[PDB]
Amino acid sequence: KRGDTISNTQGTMDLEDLISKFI
Amino acid sequence: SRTSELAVGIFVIIFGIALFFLAMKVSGLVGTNLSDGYTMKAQFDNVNGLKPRAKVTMSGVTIGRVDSITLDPVTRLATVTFDLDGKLTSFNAEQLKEVQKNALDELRYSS
Amino acid sequence: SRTSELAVGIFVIIFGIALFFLAMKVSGLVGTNLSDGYTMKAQFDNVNGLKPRAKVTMSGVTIGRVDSITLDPVTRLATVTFDLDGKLTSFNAEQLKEVQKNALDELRYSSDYTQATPAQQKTMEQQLISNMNSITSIDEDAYIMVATNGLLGEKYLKIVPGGGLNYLKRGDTISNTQGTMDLEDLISKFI
Amino acid sequence: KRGDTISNTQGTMDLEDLISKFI
Amino acid sequence: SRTSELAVGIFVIIFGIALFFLAMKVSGLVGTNLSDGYTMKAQFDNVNGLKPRAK
Amino acid sequence: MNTIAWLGRLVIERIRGIGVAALMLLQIIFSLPSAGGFGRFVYQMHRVGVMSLLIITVSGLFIGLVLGLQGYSILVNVGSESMLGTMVSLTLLRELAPVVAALLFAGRAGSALTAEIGSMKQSEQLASMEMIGVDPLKQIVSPRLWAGIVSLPMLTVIFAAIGIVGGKLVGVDFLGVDEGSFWSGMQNNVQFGHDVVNGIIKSIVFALLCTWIAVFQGYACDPTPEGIATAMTRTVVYSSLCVLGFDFVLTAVMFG
Amino acid sequence: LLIITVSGLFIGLVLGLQGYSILVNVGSESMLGTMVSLTLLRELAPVVAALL
Amino acid sequence: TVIFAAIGIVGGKLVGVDFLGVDEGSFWSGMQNNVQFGHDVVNGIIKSIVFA
Numbered sequence: 090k091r092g093d094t095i096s097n098t099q100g101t102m103d104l105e106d107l108i109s110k111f112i
Numbered sequence: 113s114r115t116s117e118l119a120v121g122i123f124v125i126i127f128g129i130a131l132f133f134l135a136m137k138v139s140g141l142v143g144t145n146l147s148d149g150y151t152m153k154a155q156f157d158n159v160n161g162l163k164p165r166a167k168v169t170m171s172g173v174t175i176g177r178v179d180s181i182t183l184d185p186v187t188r189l190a191t192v193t194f195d196l197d198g199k200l201t202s203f204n205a206e207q208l209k210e211v212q213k214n215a216l217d218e219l220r221y222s223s
Numbered sequence: 224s225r226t227s228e229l230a231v232g233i234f235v236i237i238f239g240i241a242l243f244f245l246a247m248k249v250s251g252l253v254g255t256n257l258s259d260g261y262t263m264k265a266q267f268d269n270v271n272g273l274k275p276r277a278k279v280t281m282s283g284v285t286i287g288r289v290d291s292i293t294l295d296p297v298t299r300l301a302t303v304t305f306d307l308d309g310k311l312t313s314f315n316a317e318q319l320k321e322v323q324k325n326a327l328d329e330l331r332y333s334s335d336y337t338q339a340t341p342a343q344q345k346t347m348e349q350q351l352i353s354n355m356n357s358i359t360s361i362d363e364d365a366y367i368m369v370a371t372n373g374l375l376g377e378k379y380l381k382i383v384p385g386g387g388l389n390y391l392k393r394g395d396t397i398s399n400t401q402g403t404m405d406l407e408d409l410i411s412k413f414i
Numbered sequence: 415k416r417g418d419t420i421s422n423t424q425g426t427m428d429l430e431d432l433i434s435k436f437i
Numbered sequence: 438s439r440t441s442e443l444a445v446g447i448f449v450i451i452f453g454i455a456l457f458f459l460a461m462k463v464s465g466l467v468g469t470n471l472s473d474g475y476t477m478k479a480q481f482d483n484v485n486g487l488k489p490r491a492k
Numbered sequence: 493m494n495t496i497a498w499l500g501r502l503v504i505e506r507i508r509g510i511g512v513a514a515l516m517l518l519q520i521i522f523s524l525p526s527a528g529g530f531g532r533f534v535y536q537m538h539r540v541g542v543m544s545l546l547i548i549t550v551s552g553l554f555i556g557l558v559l560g561l562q563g564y565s566i567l568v569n570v571g572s573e574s575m576l577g578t579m580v581s582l583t584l585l586r587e588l589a590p591v592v593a594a595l596l597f598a599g600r601a602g603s604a605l606t607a608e609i610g611s612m613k614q615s616e617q618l619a620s621m622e623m624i625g626v627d628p629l630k631q632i633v634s635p636r637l638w639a640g641i642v643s644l645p646m647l648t649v650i651f652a653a654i655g656i657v658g659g660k661l662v663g664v665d666f667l668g669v670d671e672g673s674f675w676s677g678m679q680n681n682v683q684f685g686h687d688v689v690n691g692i693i694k695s696i697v698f699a700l701l702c703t704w705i706a707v708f709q710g711y712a713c714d715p716t717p718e719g720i721a722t723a724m725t726r727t728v729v730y731s732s733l734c735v736l737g738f739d740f741v742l743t744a745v746m747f748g
Numbered sequence: 749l750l751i752i753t754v755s756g757l758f759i760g761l762v763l764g765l766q767g768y769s770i771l772v773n774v775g776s777e778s779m780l781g782t783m784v785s786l787t788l789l790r791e792l793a794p795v796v797a798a799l800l
Numbered sequence: 801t802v803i804f805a806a807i808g809i810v811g812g813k814l815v816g817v818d819f820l821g822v823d824e825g826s827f828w829s830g831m832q833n834n835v836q837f838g839h840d841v842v843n844g845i846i847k848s849i850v851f852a
């Protein structure tokens with residue numbers, strides 16, 4: 090509806106996030 | 113005096129032209145006007161770098177802006193409130209029927 | 224009236240100095256404009272690129288600043304002193320009683336009922352009067368780390384919360400850190 | 415002691431050899 | 438009130454010289470010291486890009 | 493200590509001069525308006541504003557030509573020639589158009605205000621107006637102060653507009669960057685409230701300082717033909733130090 | 749000599765404050781002395797000292 | 801203009817190194833690498849002789 094909450098998120102990916110993905 | 117009042121009136125015409133060029137050719141001012149936009153909100157775990165008045169896109173098309181980002185220190189997840197649009201994201205007369213019959217058909221199929 | 228005009232000319236200069244130091248405080252170059260900022264500290268093993276007056280964030284929203292970084296050569300670990308924030312890194316009585324009745328029942332749960340003497344939450348009365356004075360929203364096993372603001376920006380300190388039943392008082396030392404990621408020695412292994 | 419020589423080093427690694435390795 | 442004119446003239450010359458000593462300090466020009474620094478040395482095989490007065 | 497006494501006597505009379513100029517400003521802006529005072533203001537918008545329109549227009553074009561020529565040489569080596577319109581418009585709007593347009597206003601329209609008021613004092617038109625029963629601070633000084641506070645923020649907007657047009661002319665039309673990427677990168681990173689309005693707030697602070705100095709030095713002049721000329725070079729020196737001094741304070745607040 | 753000395757100090761203060769904000773977002777704060785000295789030596793010191 | 805450019809670099813070093821906290825040795829070494837004397841310093845003096 091109008092005004093609800095989207096309930097699946099994921100935050101930003103900075104440099105330390107990109108590294109821990111590849112390993 | 114009739115010349116000096118005539119020449120000052122030209123100094124206000126050239127000022128109004130330059131304020132028009134600065135506002136509506138150089139800045140993003142004319143492109144911030146949302147049509148009957150509602151308001152949703154989501155809750156993240158890292159919003160680092162997200163500023164207010166940032167952009168919301170669906171398929172590469174801008175459909176809103178970002179209003180406010182706060183903590184909520186009882187759950188410690190950041191809460192973003194964003195306001196979308198009327199035309200590009202809400203349905204209309206023909207489209208509502210086009211999803212009303214299929215939502216019954218996706219429900220009352222053979223399965 | 225040479226003295227009446229000279230006193231006005233001195234008052235204009237002092238007003239121009241007071242406006243200067245008000246502008247440096249607002250800009251952030253001198254002082255600390257946040258909200259009843261208490262002080263925490265932590266001990267890292269590599270703080271390369273971290274400068275004083277840097278940023279501390281919880282989930283991306285800025286909750287503090289860095290004060291000073293010293294070395295301590297007997298242990299050879301850097302010690303970052305940072306001051307946080309009272310307004311939004313803590314909670315007040317409505318949320319504080321919300322975790323007063325929470326932490327009494329959760330710590331004295333169905334397991335810890337048959338683990339001590341029959342006090343019947345008498346010790347739960349002692350723990351809650353130590354709770355209200357000077358408590359933070361940082362749980363006992365959150366870990367702080369040195370993050371890097373994009374791909375090429377400056378470095379800040381990120382507090383990653385998770386789990387935790389106890390909480391940290393105002394002034395303690397966060398006991399789980401990790402330093403900056405040496406992107407030299409990452410590639411040195413990958414060859 | 416003050417004045418000695420650190421006898422464990424490793425030099426720098428240029429980006430030409432990095433590519434050389436990563437073929 | 439010659440003594441008031443004699444005092445403000447002194448503070449202007451005092452502040453004018455103390456600006457000059459502070460200017461030559463904030464630059465390699467004279468000074469550039471370190472808190473009783475001893476000296477070590479090391480042997481490498483490639484120092485490509487290292488320049489004196491590094492850290 | 494013969495010159496040390498002369499140096500201390502010099503800076504005391506300058507401190508006392510700020511006290512007279514502060515009380516002179518509070519007597520102008522805190523008073524009731526009067527009869528026929530709007531028409532005297534529109535006449536002084538012609539002498540201060542319209543007369544300065546030719547130095548401001550040509551100097552803004554020449555500065556935008558250098559910015560588009562120097563900014564192309566930096567950005568082309570890092571693969572970001574599409575950010576040329578962003579760096580040209582953001583250099584003018586927050587640094588160069590408030591400051592350089594205030595250094596040419598202090599030279600042309602500031603030094604001409606302290607010569608007009610100063611020759612009224614020498615030829616005793618200010619003493620003749622006072623003995624008739626008309627305050628010369630309201631009749632003569634007050635239209636000239638308000639015409640400078642209005643005309644300088646109107647002239648840095650024209651300065652910044654031709655600087656961007658001049659930088660587009662060397663960048664797009666001679667060095668050959670894409671026209672659609674010039675304006676789209678500018679409309680993305682330049683905000684109106686943070687970059688355009690913050691440049692107008694600077695030029696209102698500068699217009700108050702450049703005109704209050706120029707008006708005071710002609711009123712408190714020395715009615716002697718080389719006492720007027722000593723005053724005209726004091727409004728160019730004192731306004732330039734106040735423009736560059738208040739510019740550091742305003743960028744540390746707005747963009748720091 | 750007194751207008752030139754004080755105006756040169758005030759302009760270098762703005763260049764080091766504005767040039768830090770640009771360079772810190774691209775990881776090149778070590779190029780601060782290059783852009784401060786090259787802005788003065790080829791653009792600002794010939795032009796602003798000739799306007800004063 | 802040589803005195804103008806010298807205090808502008810000293811003023812920019814004072815806000816950059818001594819207040820914002822960049823490395824002092826990288827301030828001067830990046831400057832001594834990219835700034836040439838004949839192309840950047842002498843070309844600023846040739847400008848100020850034409851202006852004078």
Ligand SMILES: CCCCCC/C=C/CCCCCCCCCC(=O)O[C@H](COC(=O)CCCCCCCCCCCCCCC)COP(=O)(O)OC[C@@H](O)CO
Binds near residue numbers: 236239506513514741
């Ligand atoms: C009531 C409204 C108050 C608003 C102002 C608030 C800020 C106050 C600070 C400075 C204001 C200066 C403006 C002065 C206006 C009158 C100018 C003037 O005329 O005063 C002159 C003083 O110099 C001078 O301004 C000094 C000229 C050079 C100034 C250089 C310093 C500028 C640096 C500013 C730093 C920012 C500080 C403020 C930031 C909040 C002296 O006059 P003279 O002709 O020599 O005396 C006549 C006799 O000597 C005869 O020979």
Ligand SMILES: CCCCCC/C=C/CCCCCCCCCC(=O)O[C@H](COC(=O)CCCCCCCCCCCCCCC)COP(=O)(O)OC[C@@H](O)CO
Binds near residue numbers: 245
């Ligand atoms: C991290 C934060 C990012 C910034 C968020 C802002 C978003 C952009 C939106 C809007 C822009 C706000 C930026 C601050 C605006 C500066 C205000 C200012 O600088 O105020 C000026 C003071 O100037 C003088 O005295 C010279 C004196 C200067 C010292 C004044 C100290 C200012 C302290 C109050 C300003 C609050 C700043 C709010 C910004 C966070 C007054 O300007 P005028 O109205 O023309 O008055 C005309 C004068 O003649 C006075 O009679």
Ligand SMILES: CCCCCC/C=C/CCCCCCCCCC(=O)O[C@H](COC(=O)CCCCCCCCCCCCCCC)COP(=O)(O)OC[C@@H](O)CO
Binds near residue numbers: 839846849850
């Ligand atoms: C791709 C190439 C890279 C560059 C390589 C250069 C390497 C750097 C080393 C040295 C720097 C050379 C750069 C060119 C120097 C500019 C010369 C110049 O600009 O000449 C000036 C002419 O100025 C005026 O008329 C204003 C008139 C200006 C029009 C003059 C046209 C100049 C044409 C001859 C210059 C040859 C340029 C050589 C550079 C390739 C004269 O300067 P002054 O000696 O002070 O004379 C004093 C004046 O009062 C005249 O009485």
Ligand SMILES: CCCCCC/C=C\CCCCCCCCCC(=O)O[C@H](COC(=O)CCCCCCCCCCCCCCC)COP(=O)(O)OC[C@@H](O)CO
Binds near residue numbers: 115116126129657
């Ligand atoms: C979207 C982008 C936005 C940009 C908006 C556009 C920007 C503005 C555009 C154009 C602005 C043009 C400026 C017009 C200047 C108007 C000046 C003016 O109009 O002033 C006149 C005099 O100008 C005078 O000196 C005559 C002044 C000198 C004449 C000029 C002579 C030089 C030109 C000749 C040489 C050609 C140039 C060389 C090219 C190769 C007034 O005459 P006065 O006798 O003094 O006063 C009379 C009063 O008592 C009663 O009337």
Ligand SMILES: CCCCCC/C=C\CCCCCCCCCC(=O)O[C@H](COC(=O)CCCCCCCCCCCCCCC)COP(=O)(O)OC[C@@H](O)CO
Binds near residue numbers: 240729
């Ligand atoms: C701490 C906060 C500082 C800012 C707050 C101050 C705000 C109020 C300002 C008050 C101004 C003082 C008023 C009394 C002094 C009179 C000023 C003056 O005397 O004016 C000029 C000098 O000003 C000058 O030094 C410029 C005068 C200001 C000096 C500033 C320069 C030093 C400041 C240090 C910079 C700080 C950071 C660096 C620290 C290492 C004199 O130039 P003249 O040689 O006469 O030119 C000749 C013509 O004028 C005649 O035809």
Ligand SMILES: CCCCCC/C=C\CCCCCCCCCC(=O)O[C@H](COC(=O)CCCCCCCCCCCCCCC)COP(=O)(O)OC[C@@H](O)CO
Binds near residue numbers: 528
């Ligand atoms: C935040 C509050 C407002 C900001 C201001 C803050 C400053 C403090 C308050 C200022 C206002 C107080 C009101 C009193 C004004 C006192 C000045 C005054 O009253 O001056 C008057 C001039 O008219 C005049 O307003 C000059 C006539 C009007 C001048 C201004 C014209 C405005 C047009 C441009 C406005 C820009 C808006 C555009 C936005 C895009 C009277 O002068 P005279 O008639 O010649 O006297 C002669 C006789 O006495 C003897 O011969």
Ligand SMILES: CCCCCC/C=C\CCCCCCCCCC(=O)O[C@H](COC(=O)CCCCCCCCCCCCCCC)COP(=O)(O)OC[C@@H](O)CO
Binds near residue numbers: 449502806
């Ligand atoms: C490595 C980096 C390289 C950098 C190199 C260093 C750069 C240069 C360093 C310092 C330069 C300082 C400038 C000195 C100025 C000398 C001016 C001078 O010396 O001029 C004198 C007057 O100055 C006068 O007005 C007195 C002038 C006004 C006095 C100043 C008053 C303002 C200061 C007081 C306020 C304090 C500032 C506020 C701080 C908070 C001469 O007197 P006259 O009677 O006119 O002539 C007499 C002749 O007939 C015969 O003698």
